[PDB]
Amino acid sequence: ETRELQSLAAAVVPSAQTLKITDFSFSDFELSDLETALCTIRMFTDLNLVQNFQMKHEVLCRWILSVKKNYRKNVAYHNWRHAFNTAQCMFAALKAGKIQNKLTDLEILALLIAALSHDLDHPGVSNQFLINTNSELALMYNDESVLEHHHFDQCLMILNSPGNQILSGLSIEEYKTTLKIIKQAILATDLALYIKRRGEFFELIRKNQFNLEDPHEKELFLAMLMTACDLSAITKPWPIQQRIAELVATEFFDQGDRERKELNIEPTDLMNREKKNKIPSMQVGFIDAICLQLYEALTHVSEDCFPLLDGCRKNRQKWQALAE
Ligand SMILES: CCCOCCn1c(=O)c(NCCN2CCOCC2)nc2ccc(-c3ccc(OC)nc3)nc21
Ligand SMILES: [Mg+2]
Ligand SMILES: [Mg+2]
Ligand SMILES: [Zn+2]
């Protein structure tokens, strides 16, 4: 819609202070879609990206709305609000968490774009579902990070779209580099890849060998940061985290519904509304096995990222209290 673009581009963008986007404890629940878009513009602006890379205001506005409209409204969790929340946690980590200081302008540009774009056109079903249902996507990408490849494809398609070319102001070297960072950052949101690569990260920190001047370590850090931001709802104040957890479960059970009907299987516990009683012990196991070490390691990298760790620990106890 042209009107929606014109509304957004003509709107005054409140300050980061007013929008509370620097807060790790930030919540989007009370915000309109328009307000989420204004927040996004402010993230680009206060990370000095609109200035640095000479972005036209209307081009940025169109791109944001194009990203937003390419998330599905019938997917409970992996929708625009999750993407938006991921981007906001990135902003918070960069600003209040002091990660900005450790990265180049290009890396920040690519990280912001990847956060917003990383679940584009998510269908509300997992990679394994797409593989099982012989979807053409799983065929294109050899059953490997299927959704994530698709998300990157969508990201590129929008970046290439007339009027949406927010990177048109980059030099060729910067453009190529930025696109590569974006691709690797979006792929990193496959939790399979996180598991595969996190040991190296944890051991670099343990041996005091962590050095962001190393290109390979930089890429590794960026992947870890993406996973951290992506999973950050789990670190939110209990009532916020609890509401988002309900959405996560809704999407998982919707998939299980599809699996019963389309595949005639009993879904795995994660996907099985009939076994919703497992949610709390499953949240505890997930926090222990996946989340805690990540937020610890990030705090090791920058002590100002502690609130994510604190939040995660507090929510673990709450879930454990329900489970035990
Ligand atoms: C909440 C439903 C039950 O979830 C159990 C936890 N939980 C899981 O038990 C799980 N299991 C499958 C992981 N594998 C597939 C990929 O390859 C490796 C293994 N995946 C999860 C993914 C996201 C969240 C999640 C995100 C945000 C949030 O914010 C509040 N809460 C949870 N919670 C998850
Ligand atoms: Mg994803
Ligand atoms: Mg150059
Ligand atoms: Zn995500």
GROMACS .gro file of C-alpha atoms in nm, residues 96-257:
model
  162
   96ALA     CA    1   2.323  -0.076   2.624
   97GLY     CA    2   2.519  -0.403   2.588
   98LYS     CA    3   2.811  -0.215   2.429
   99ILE     CA    4   2.854  -0.459   2.139
  100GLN     CA    5   2.848  -0.165   1.891
  101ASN     CA    6   3.202  -0.082   2.006
  102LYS     CA    7   3.330  -0.420   1.892
  103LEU     CA    8   3.187  -0.410   1.537
  104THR     CA    9   3.224  -0.211   1.214
  105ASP     CA   10   2.942  -0.003   1.062
  106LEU     CA   11   2.895  -0.266   0.789
  107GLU     CA   12   2.865  -0.546   1.043
  108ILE     CA   13   2.600  -0.349   1.235
  109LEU     CA   14   2.412  -0.269   0.912
  110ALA     CA   15   2.415  -0.636   0.815
  111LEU     CA   16   2.317  -0.752   1.167
  112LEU     CA   17   2.017  -0.513   1.178
  113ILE     CA   18   1.900  -0.619   0.833
  114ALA     CA   19   1.948  -0.991   0.920
  115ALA     CA   20   1.760  -0.958   1.249
  116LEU     CA   21   1.458  -0.799   1.072
  117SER     CA   22   1.479  -1.040   0.778
  118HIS     CA   23   1.579  -1.373   0.936
  119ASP     CA   24   1.241  -1.547   0.941
  120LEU     CA   25   1.090  -1.395   0.624
  121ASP     CA   26   0.788  -1.594   0.497
  122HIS     CA   27   0.815  -1.850   0.775
  123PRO     CA   28   0.530  -2.101   0.719
  124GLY     CA   29   0.488  -2.189   1.088
  125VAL     CA   30   0.633  -2.540   1.038
  126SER     CA   31   0.991  -2.666   1.099
  127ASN     CA   32   1.263  -2.772   0.854
  128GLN     CA   33   1.186  -3.134   0.940
  129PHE     CA   34   0.820  -3.087   0.836
  130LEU     CA   35   0.926  -2.945   0.497
  131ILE     CA   36   1.163  -3.235   0.449
  132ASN     CA   37   0.889  -3.488   0.546
  133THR     CA   38   0.630  -3.332   0.315
  134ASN     CA   39   0.881  -3.333   0.025
  135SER     CA   40   0.852  -2.953  -0.014
  136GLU     CA   41   1.034  -2.806  -0.318
  137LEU     CA   42   1.242  -2.589  -0.078
  138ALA     CA   43   1.400  -2.891   0.092
  139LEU     CA   44   1.483  -3.017  -0.257
  140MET     CA   45   1.650  -2.687  -0.362
  141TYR     CA   46   1.875  -2.687  -0.050
  142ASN     CA   47   1.953  -3.058   0.006
  143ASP     CA   48   1.751  -3.072   0.333
  144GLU     CA   49   2.002  -2.833   0.498
  145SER     CA   50   1.887  -2.519   0.678
  146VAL     CA   51   1.590  -2.516   0.441
  147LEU     CA   52   1.383  -2.237   0.597
  148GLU     CA   53   1.691  -2.028   0.662
  149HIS     CA   54   1.804  -2.042   0.301
  150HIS     CA   55   1.449  -1.945   0.205
  151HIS     CA   56   1.456  -1.657   0.453
  152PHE     CA   57   1.782  -1.532   0.293
  153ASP     CA   58   1.629  -1.567  -0.056
  154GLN     CA   59   1.331  -1.355   0.055
  155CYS     CA   60   1.570  -1.105   0.211
  156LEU     CA   61   1.759  -1.070  -0.121
  157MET     CA   62   1.441  -1.047  -0.326
  158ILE     CA   63   1.326  -0.751  -0.114
  159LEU     CA   64   1.671  -0.585  -0.119
  160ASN     CA   65   1.659  -0.615  -0.499
  161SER     CA   66   1.300  -0.483  -0.529
  162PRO     CA   67   1.235  -0.145  -0.701
  163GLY     CA   68   1.213   0.131  -0.439
  164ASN     CA   69   1.340  -0.103  -0.164
  165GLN     CA   70   1.715  -0.088  -0.238
  166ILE     CA   71   1.849   0.039   0.098
  167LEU     CA   72   2.200  -0.080   0.005
  168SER     CA   73   2.212   0.099  -0.333
  169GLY     CA   74   2.431   0.363  -0.167
  170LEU     CA   75   2.707   0.113  -0.081
  171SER     CA   76   3.029   0.064  -0.276
  172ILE     CA   77   3.057  -0.270  -0.458
  173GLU     CA   78   3.306  -0.410  -0.203
  174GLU     CA   79   3.081  -0.306   0.089
  175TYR     CA   80   2.768  -0.443  -0.083
  176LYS     CA   81   2.927  -0.786  -0.143
  177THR     CA   82   3.061  -0.796   0.215
  178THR     CA   83   2.727  -0.688   0.362
  179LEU     CA   84   2.532  -0.951   0.168
  180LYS     CA   85   2.772  -1.221   0.287
  181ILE     CA   86   2.735  -1.113   0.650
  182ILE     CA   87   2.354  -1.110   0.606
  183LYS     CA   88   2.351  -1.460   0.460
  184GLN     CA   89   2.573  -1.605   0.734
  185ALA     CA   90   2.373  -1.424   1.006
  186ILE     CA   91   2.038  -1.556   0.877
  187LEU     CA   92   2.178  -1.910   0.837
  188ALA     CA   93   2.309  -1.887   1.195
  189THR     CA   94   1.948  -1.877   1.321
  190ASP     CA   95   1.919  -2.248   1.244
  191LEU     CA   96   1.957  -2.393   1.594
  192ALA     CA   97   2.130  -2.696   1.435
  193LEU     CA   98   2.412  -2.467   1.319
  194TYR     CA   99   2.422  -2.301   1.663
  195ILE     CA  100   2.478  -2.640   1.829
  196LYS     CA  101   2.743  -2.735   1.571
  197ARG     CA  102   2.952  -2.420   1.622
  198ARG     CA  103   2.898  -2.298   1.980
  199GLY     CA  104   3.167  -2.522   2.136
  200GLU     CA  105   3.438  -2.339   1.946
  201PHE     CA  106   3.300  -2.007   2.072
  202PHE     CA  107   3.282  -2.119   2.436
  203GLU     CA  108   3.639  -2.256   2.416
  204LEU     CA  109   3.785  -1.939   2.263
  205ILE     CA  110   3.639  -1.746   2.557
  206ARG     CA  111   3.756  -2.010   2.808
  207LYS     CA  112   4.117  -1.998   2.680
  208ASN     CA  113   4.119  -1.615   2.655
  209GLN     CA  114   4.184  -1.654   2.279
  210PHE     CA  115   3.872  -1.466   2.173
  211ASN     CA  116   3.988  -1.206   1.922
  212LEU     CA  117   3.741  -1.019   1.700
  213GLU     CA  118   4.033  -0.901   1.478
  214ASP     CA  119   4.039  -1.258   1.345
  215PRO     CA  120   3.791  -1.276   1.050
  216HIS     CA  121   3.685  -1.630   1.136
  217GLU     CA  122   3.617  -1.542   1.501
  218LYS     CA  123   3.421  -1.232   1.395
  219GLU     CA  124   3.183  -1.446   1.182
  220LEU     CA  125   3.151  -1.690   1.469
  221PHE     CA  126   3.068  -1.406   1.712
  222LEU     CA  127   2.805  -1.266   1.475
  223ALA     CA  128   2.631  -1.606   1.449
  224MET     CA  129   2.629  -1.642   1.826
  225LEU     CA  130   2.487  -1.289   1.865
  226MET     CA  131   2.209  -1.372   1.618
  227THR     CA  132   2.105  -1.682   1.813
  228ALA     CA  133   2.118  -1.477   2.136
  229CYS     CA  134   1.888  -1.210   1.992
  230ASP     CA  135   1.660  -1.465   1.827
  231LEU     CA  136   1.600  -1.657   2.152
  232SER     CA  137   1.583  -1.341   2.371
  233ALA     CA  138   1.209  -1.359   2.442
  234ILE     CA  139   1.306  -1.636   2.687
  235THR     CA  140   1.502  -1.375   2.889
  236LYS     CA  141   1.215  -1.122   2.918
  237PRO     CA  142   1.036  -1.036   3.240
  238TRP     CA  143   0.817  -1.331   3.341
  239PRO     CA  144   0.480  -1.193   3.220
  240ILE     CA  145   0.623  -1.089   2.884
  241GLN     CA  146   0.810  -1.421   2.845
  242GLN     CA  147   0.503  -1.620   2.950
  243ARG     CA  148   0.283  -1.449   2.687
  244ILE     CA  149   0.540  -1.508   2.412
  245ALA     CA  150   0.588  -1.870   2.527
  246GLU     CA  151   0.213  -1.919   2.468
  247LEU     CA  152   0.269  -1.807   2.106
  248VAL     CA  153   0.568  -2.040   2.063
  249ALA     CA  154   0.352  -2.333   2.185
  250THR     CA  155   0.058  -2.230   1.963
  251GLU     CA  156   0.274  -2.244   1.648
  252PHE     CA  157   0.430  -2.578   1.752
  253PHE     CA  158   0.085  -2.732   1.817
  254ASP     CA  159  -0.051  -2.594   1.490
  255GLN     CA  160   0.226  -2.787   1.315
  256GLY     CA  161   0.134  -3.101   1.508
  257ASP     CA  162  -0.226  -3.052   1.397
   0.00000   0.00000   0.00000
